[PDB]
Amino acid sequence: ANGVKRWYQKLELPMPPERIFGAHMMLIGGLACLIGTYFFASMTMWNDGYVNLTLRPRLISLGIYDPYDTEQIQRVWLPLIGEFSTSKLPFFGQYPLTMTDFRLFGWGCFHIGLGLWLVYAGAAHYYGARGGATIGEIFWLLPYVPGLKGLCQIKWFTPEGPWYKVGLPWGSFANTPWPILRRTYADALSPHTIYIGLLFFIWGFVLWFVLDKPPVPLQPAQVMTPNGLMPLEQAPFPYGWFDPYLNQVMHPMNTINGETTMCFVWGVLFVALGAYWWYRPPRSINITHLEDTKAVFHVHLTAIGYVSFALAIVGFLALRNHPSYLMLNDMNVIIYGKKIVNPGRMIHNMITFNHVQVGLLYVAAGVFHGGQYLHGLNISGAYKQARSKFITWFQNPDLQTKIVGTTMFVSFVTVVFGYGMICWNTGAELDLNFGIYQFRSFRAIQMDGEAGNIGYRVFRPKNPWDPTAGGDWVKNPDGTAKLVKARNLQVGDRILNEELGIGSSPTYSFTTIEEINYKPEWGQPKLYAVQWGSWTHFLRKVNPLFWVDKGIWYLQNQKTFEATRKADEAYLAAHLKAVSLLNQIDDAQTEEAKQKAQAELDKFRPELEKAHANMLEWNERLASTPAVLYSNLRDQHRDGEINDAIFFWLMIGGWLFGFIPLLRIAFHNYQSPWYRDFEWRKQSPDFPCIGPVKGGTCGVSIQDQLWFCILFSIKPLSAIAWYLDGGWIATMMARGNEAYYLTHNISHTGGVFLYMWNETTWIWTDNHLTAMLLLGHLIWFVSFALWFKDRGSRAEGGDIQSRWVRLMGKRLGIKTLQEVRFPVSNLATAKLWGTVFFYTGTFVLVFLYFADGFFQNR
Amino acid sequence: VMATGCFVGARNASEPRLGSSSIAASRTAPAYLREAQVLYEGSTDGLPKDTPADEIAHYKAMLAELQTRNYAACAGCHQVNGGGNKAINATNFQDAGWQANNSSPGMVTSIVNGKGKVMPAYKDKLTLQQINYLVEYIRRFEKKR
Amino acid sequence: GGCFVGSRDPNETRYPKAPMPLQNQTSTLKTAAQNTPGAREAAALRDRVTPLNLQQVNEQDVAGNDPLGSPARVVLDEGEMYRDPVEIYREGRALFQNNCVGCHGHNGCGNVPRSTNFTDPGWQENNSDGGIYSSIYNGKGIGNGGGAMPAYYNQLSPQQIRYLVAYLRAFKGRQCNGLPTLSDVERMVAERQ
Amino acid sequence: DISKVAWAWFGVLLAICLIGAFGNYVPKLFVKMLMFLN
Amino acid sequence: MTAILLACLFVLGGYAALWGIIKFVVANTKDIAAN
Amino acid sequence: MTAILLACLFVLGGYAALWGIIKFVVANTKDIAAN
Amino acid sequence: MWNVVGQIISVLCFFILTVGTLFGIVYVSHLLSRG
Amino acid sequence: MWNVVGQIISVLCFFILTVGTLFGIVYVSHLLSRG
Ligand code: 2GO
Ligand code: BCL
Ligand code: CLA
Ligand SMILES: CNCCOP(=O)(O)O[C@H](COC(=O)CCCCCCCCCCCC(C)C)OC(=O)CCCCCCCCCCCC(C)C
Ligand SMILES: CNCCOP(=O)(O)O[C@H](COC(=O)CCCCCCCCCCCC(C)C)OC(=O)CCCCCCCCCCCC(C)C
Ligand SMILES: CC(C)CCCCCCCCCCCC(=O)OC[C@@H](OC(=O)CCCCCCCCCCCC(C)C)OP(=O)(O)OCCN
Ligand code: HEC
Ligand code: HEC
Ligand code: SF4
Ligand SMILES: [Ca+2]
């Protein structure tokens, strides 16, 4: 509490309102100037990059960015404009410009104009509260720009100034004698929600009359398109409601018109809720400590975190298959010279994971900040006499250990289940022998087709149920190995691994057929013989989301489901009967019998072709029905996978793993039960320890629990990233086209570890992304310097280094070096910067898994 | 603040035709594929009778220049429609197995470098942006199965 | 981990092959068992199973350093290339299992995103042998050292790439359980390579 | 020191270890009890 | 819409389920101090 | 034999080199304490 | 469905072996420092 | 001969800029934290 600690804590709560208000208004104005520049960065003369690409789908949907507009403009407004001083537009003049460049420049300028003015008006409230300020204090870096000192004594934002430099003439909100103004923060909740309702109404008027998207049901009967004037329902997506990439009319609320009708809906709701609160503001005793801005800061901030998580979820679904993003896949997208696989989905993934990441940070930081309010209360005596039940509901220390311990138990059980299943199935997929057990892989041999006429040597047991049976090789009467055709494989049969070409399982010798004539519930339309070893395909159904999704889809699609089932049925019967006819040919034994047989097969054949084409086309019609929750790349149903089931369990376990430190902040900011047995009392929110006593105590403060939340949460977050970008999370080494994935029509990019090496071969083909990869790795491992129990070693070595450098200064007569003292971070600041370095390392590196492309092929 | 925009540079495109942005054309599928079809066919003849006079003559000037550098058109090895020639081993772009087992990024370098014996290198004939357009046109030849 | 490895398969002899020549195959300097109880069975058995061109090859012998190793100049003589299935199998499975499985799978059906899948008939029909050499030699895609399909012109010899080319045509129309066997290579070679 | 109860877990872990190795190495070697063969 | 509603309902359901467990423990261990 | 002797001597000279450096620093900063 | 009854037996033995072993190293690490 | 000299000059500048920058980070760390 003397070093660097007073720099990132210089602006703490509570604060006066004019100071919060003006500072927010200035940030708003600054964020509008930055978006201004992003509009300039989106014009059509620039390369694709990750900024202008995250904005383009939305700019298309608004009609600002026209995808099919090539005509160059040469005059538009004021007379004669080939190019000027910076030219016809400042510096945009050497370029050829279209209408969408002008729209983009118009919107960019507005943003910059309205931003700059919001910055000024915000400084009028901010500096105006203080009586006013000087150009030299506002800007502060003008003292050392000699000359300009006569215009750095001028006072701005003053109370009685001439109009153009006034600030707040009555000094503060509370003194100004306007009765409309509300005097507390509860009271003010009402005009705030009226103001927000009005911002909605503004966006809908702009949508309707400036962007020309009327609200449903007042949509136009026709729209203008690059091919002329077209009925709304046939005009393609940016212009009308017809989705080209799914080839269907869009629901009316799936369009930007749907969005302008919701503008008016939401606006009316917010205005009415504000009118209600104008007569009935919040009042209960449970809430009146929230007038302190330090306390509401906790409520608001972790609320916004939850809002951010909810944006991620809603946005993901709503837009995973929307024509805004798919339209990027036809725009010849080139980044750092390259050509991207599926840039639509990539950009979509980046926006949703960016919201996800904001959600975690703000929830955690809101809780941390709440822990600071509560520690304050304890350390001044008034925690024990808080009156709101939102504090007092959790004061009993024994309830606090019951809450925490059962959320550890729930975390434990569900993480053990998830991770334990991942481990079981990587054992299965890798065919590992443990001596005590042999893991066995999925393997499939087609049994219909022409592949069902391929022969195999088969070792057949007689009676698996008599231990001490044994088996024999299937043979001819002549003694030589009979080749069994795949159609005649039976359950129990063993085939040599090396007759199948398998070199990856050298520890066991045979594949066992465990199921014949198998057709995947969801998968390829074929019939198979299977070794299910240890691979647990049933685990897909251990997912409550498998069942809700499939039940609702069955209900919407019941009678094509039913006909597809009857087609499969008729086909399996035809296959079986055709296999018996083929077998009578094989074993016919005398050409009279062999002609009779071949003539029977020749007569059944047309009918077996009919049943196959029937099954094929019902199974194709079934696989093109609309998705509910689990989706294709073309918004079609897919069954849930082992991957989806693992992701369900990992969300429960891993978010509880990551959030148990936050419950420790909320309950144990002053005393945990380990502290309370010793009589200890944590004296501040950020101390590093108090140890070596009792074995050592590093990491009990609230600041540290915040850092341990951030780390532990890296684990569910990376589950989310792998799952968005198409990794397979249910094992560690899944290969892209392994027999299981191929037979069950699953597309994935890798499998835990394998994903990592699989995506990085794509990452290596971009030299900007490989530079990012190198820098990312270096930031991270340096966090270890700062996080290991080693600060004393670093202090005592730094000291040797300082002595030495001062010896060199004194010897060589170099005055700048005879008093060097190297600065060595203390333990608290080492933990802060260690968490910073750990976090940023990891998440630059994750950006790369998204930036490489979306390789899921659906 | 940081990305004040983002300084990514200006986009490389093809040749300019007066009054119609070439940079823009290079991201608008119907414009880029019209130029890909011209390169692919070696003529402006299969272009929509709706094509403007200026367009039809800019393409011809493009071809005439390429004819002096001994450029060989893609059609007629591969045909006007795909799926080349088994005789010459010329690739069939209509085939779905050929299409699934190629990425568009990968396809690029096989046109740049040429491919084994007969398919010629185009690195000294065409710009990398004109190869990108052709990879996009070849994509639209795919048939099912 | 150690000692309790299994019994060795009697069909994999350890009987020794002749040593790799010191002289470069591209040299312009001077160009390019007994009767003891079981020594003849062991030599005959080594002649089918133990590979001769598996080892990385002298640096002057790599295809980028070989005067006749460029895609434009290599000789793809079909009679020499599809002459002997034992040999294609002996050599190409050792080279493939080592170098190519990582990215193309243990079944050779594709592991790394967008990777080839050699069992696909449509892919087989539309590739030449010379085409397959070009993509091994050059790599595929833009990047340093080839793209996502890496280049091999330092790394492999022209003779090693040719065993790879012939082996890869044994993948045609197989199912997704490991690699082509000796009789896959033989049915491929009988149906004209 | 070891409790009776912790000695009776260490017994269940060994019964699961030789029910696994007995069914893994017996059919490999004795060519019987074919149900568990691989 | 159906997918968005299902996903949100499942997140709030995980919270509600945790509340119910954590309150089946509190209600039935009320005679025992945790320690 | 030649490569073995070279390597060995290069490691032994790595240590001998360092000592000499250190000896130079000690002698030429005699009478400056390093506090 | 005998593969799903067989598979499940294995998976269940895996969980007893592993979680039994984990809480076996936690009980033997308490005897080496306190009991 | 001349390429080599040109390359030595770029490498020197890089060492002057990266080591130089690193020490400035230390000095700045020093001014914040204390003196
Ligand atoms: C060919 C691959 C290539 C090479 C060059 C490479 C090598 C190495 C080395 C080395 C010497 O070999 C190191 C030391 C190293 C280090 C790292 N790399 Zn690294 N690395 C590569 C590539 C990359 C890339 C692109 C990325 C990393 C990422 C990272 C990161 C990871 C930091 C970290 O702690 O991350 C924790 C999260 C992990 C490991 C991901 C787990 C994902 C999984 C799907 C989650 C769910 C499943 C589990 C069983 C879950 C538990 C259950 C529950 C609690 C949720 C650091 C800098 C990083 C990352 O994983 O971040 C989460 C990252 O994004 N790396 N990495
Ligand atoms: C919606 C209610 C608000 C909230 C409103 C208030 C108000 C008002 C008060 C507090 C107060 C407290 N809150 Mg709070 N607080 C919220 C969330 C949290 C969370 C959390 C993990 O999310 C924690 C750990 C805390 C903890 C705390 C303490 C710092 C403090 C008093 C102890 C305690 O109450 O234990 C809390 C323990 C928990 C176990 C609760 C966790 C569950 C929360 C309620 C909801 C999560 C679900 C969310 C809706 C899911 C989102 C939906 C999806 C996005 C689709 N709050 C949410 C955002 N909180 C009091 C205070 O004094 O601080 C200044 C106080 O008066
Ligand atoms: C990049 C990795 C890195 C570097 C360069 C260092 C550097 C050092 N460590 Mg730290 N350390 C690291 C990581 C690193 N460490 C990790 C991962 C851990 C966890 C185990 C630690 C734990 C740790 C302990 C406990 C201690 C140290 C100590 C030391 C110092 C040894 C004294 C000395 O040998 O002088 C020789 C100097 C060098 C050999 C390094 C030269 C500078 C390097 C090469 C490059 C600068 C690179 C940097 C990333 C550049 C960014 C610059 C910016 C402009 C881009 C030295 C300053 C000791 C010490 O005395 O404390 C001061 C010490 O006690 N290290
Ligand atoms: C490339 N192919 C992957 C995507 O394929 P597709 O779109 O077909 O299928 C899914 C499935 O649906 C879900 O996956 C819904 C969540 C279920 C909750 C399951 C139950 C959740 C309960 C957890 C409660 C935790 C509490 C108690 C701490 O695609 C998605 O929706 C995933 C994208 C969304 C991104 C994740 C959003 C954040 C995760 C939840 C945040 C939680 C926080 C508020 C803490
Ligand atoms: C009284 N002593 C103890 C109590 O006080 P106490 O510990 O807070 O004092 C610290 C400690 O010392 C360090 O913490 C070491 C830094 C030097 C290592 C030097 C090594 C740094 C290199 C690391 C880079 C690796 C990354 C890139 C992977 O307080 C701080 O340094 C606080 C951190 C603030 C630093 C701000 C950096 C911004 C400067 C950027 C612009 C400078 C130049 C560009 C002009
Ligand atoms: C695995 C490990 C544990 C085992 C270590 C192996 C040890 C092997 C010992 C290495 C033996 C080398 C001799 C062979 C050789 O040097 O060859 C000929 C060499 O003739 C000699 O000088 C002969 C004199 C050799 C008398 C030296 C005895 C060595 C002592 C070992 C001490 C080990 C310690 C204590 C660490 O030729 P030239 O250099 O002239 O020509 C270049 C060759 N192109
Ligand atoms: C080891 C030497 C080999 C052999 C013989 C082959 N490969 Fe690969 N491969 C990879 C990827 C991503 C592709 C797709 C490329 C693209 O379209 O984008 C391929 C493709 C091939 C082909 C087909 C070439 C063709 O033009 O059609 C062939 C014949 C080929 N491969 C053979 C990926 C990788 C690897 C990942 C890093 C590695 C290693 C290999 N390949 C190795 C080999
Ligand atoms: C014959 C003289 C050709 C002309 C002119 C063009 N191509 Fe070609 N191409 C030709 C053959 C014989 C082959 C087979 C290559 C081989 O494998 O041996 C091909 C191949 C292609 C492919 C597929 C490449 C791949 O990687 O798989 C493409 C995409 C292709 N060719 C495109 C192409 C284009 C765009 C051309 C004109 C610009 C073109 N080819 C000319 C024969 C000939
Ligand atoms: S090593 Fe550090 S954290 Fe641990 S007791 Fe000592 S000072 Fe505290
Ligand atoms: Ca990706």
Side-chain angles (χ1 to χ4, degrees), chain A residues 415 419 422 650-651 653-655 657 712 714-719 722 729 732 752 756-758 760-761 763-764 773 776-777 780-781 838 841-849:
Chain A
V415 169
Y419 178 60
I422 294 151
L650 257 28
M651 280 309 72
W655 282 107
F657 176 70
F712 299 164
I714 291 169
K715 307 293 313 191
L717 263 359
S718 312
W722 274 224
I729 246 120
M732 312 286 190
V752 196
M756 320 162 159
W757 179 91
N758 275 180
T760 302
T761 148
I763 292 155
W764 290 151
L773 181 132
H777 285 77
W780 183 83
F781 93 85
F838 195 110
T842 135
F843 283 127
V844 338
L845 307 159
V846 176
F847 184 93
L848 303 178
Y849 285 123

Side-chain angles (χ1 to χ4, degrees), chain A residues 38 41 44-45 47-48 330 332, chain B residues 3 5 8-9 11 21 23 27 32:
Chain A
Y38 286 176
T44 37
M45 75 289 289
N47 276 332
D48 303 339
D330 311 325
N332 171 236
Chain B
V8 291
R11 206 204 217 213
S21 179
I23 294 169
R27 320 180 128 107
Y32 72 70

Side-chain angles (χ1 to χ4, degrees), chain A residues 212-216 219-220 241 252-253 255-262:
Chain A
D212 185 40
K213 307 304 193 184
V216 177
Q219 66 270 0
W241 296 354
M253 305 302 308
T255 66
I256 24 63
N257 299 80
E259 187 178 319
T260 146
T261 143
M262 285 313 295

Side-chain angles (χ1 to χ4, degrees), chain F:
Chain F
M1 223 63 211
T2 301
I4 295 169
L5 295 174
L6 295 174
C8 281
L9 278 138
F10 260 87
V11 179
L12 290 172
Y15 276 87
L18 217 221
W19 178 15
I21 287 179
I22 286 160
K23 267 211 127 66
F24 178 86
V25 177
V26 175
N28 295 120
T29 71
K30 256 192 321 215
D31 103 11
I32 291 152
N35 316 144

